[PDB]
């Protein structure tokens with residue numbers, strides 16, 4: 378479903394390799410008339426902003442969104458020699474007795490982690506890193522393929538992609554019923 | 567006695583349509599009414615060129631289209647005819 382969504386999201390933005398319809402205008406202009414998207418930055422900011430927006434929404438739905446895989450869970454599982462003297466010994470094979478400064482670092486570090494500014498920052502750097510990775514994959518796609526003819530993109534949508542999607546529309550709720558996994562639709566989370 | 571015999575048109579030049587021969591009938595491989603079959607369809611012409619790449623710099627090909635498909639393609643060339651074959655007669659071989 379994710380791959381279909383990303384491919385659908387390139388075709389939706391009119392981006393290459395799905396841009397041959399709007400591409401053929403420049404080849405038949407002739408010797409008497411010309412285009413109109415000429416001095417306007419609007420349809421360029423409308424275009425680039427729809428690509429960025431299709432990357433953020435793609436990340437919201439299939440990647441974490443703003444979810445950073447938190448390493449603070451891993452350190453809890455590994456560390457077992459909690460010490461009140463600030464030594465913070467670890468029960469691991471590369472571990473030792475750390476000399477982290479309670480007065481200088483641990484008090485400061487703990488406070489900055491719970492700050493409203495810091496935690497918000499990481500939530501947006503996560504969403505930003507994920508949107509940027511997808512922005513790369515749009516640019517990489519334009520530089521990797523030739524163009525598809527309009528009839529061929531139409532066949533891709535209507536005789537390949539949508540049949541698979543409607544097949545998955547049947548199957549997915551059928552499995553969610555079979556494993557008692559229908560979520561509650563009340564305001565939780 | 568051309569061009570003298572051609573002044574009065576006493577001779578006609580044997581065109582290829584004179585020497586046309588019917589196909590052999592045996593081994594030969596492959597109307598108006600109220601129906602819409604007799605109806606005709608209009609075509610529209612399209613001026614293609616010049617494309618961005620350098621090689622197809624001066625192409626003005628005029629296509630006749632039935633919908634999407636090409637009915638007849640008429641390239642108009644000469645947009646880069648510079649008279650090379652004539653200028654070569656006024657130069658030495660090395661020139």
Ligand SMILES: CCCCCCCCCCCCO[C@@H]1O[C@H](CO)[C@@H](O[C@H]2O[C@H](CO)[C@@H](O)[C@H](O)[C@H]2O)[C@H](O)[C@H]1O
Nearest residue numbers: 389390391392396399414420421423424427430431434
């Ligand atoms: C399914 C959920 C979707 C959620 C996100 C929805 C975002 C919708 C934003 C729409 C904004 C306008 O949408 C966008 O408009 C611009 C300008 O018309 C189009 O861009 C167009 O003009 C530019 C030149 O200026 C061309 O390079 C481009 O090939 C052409 O298609 C984009 O093809 C279209 O995607």
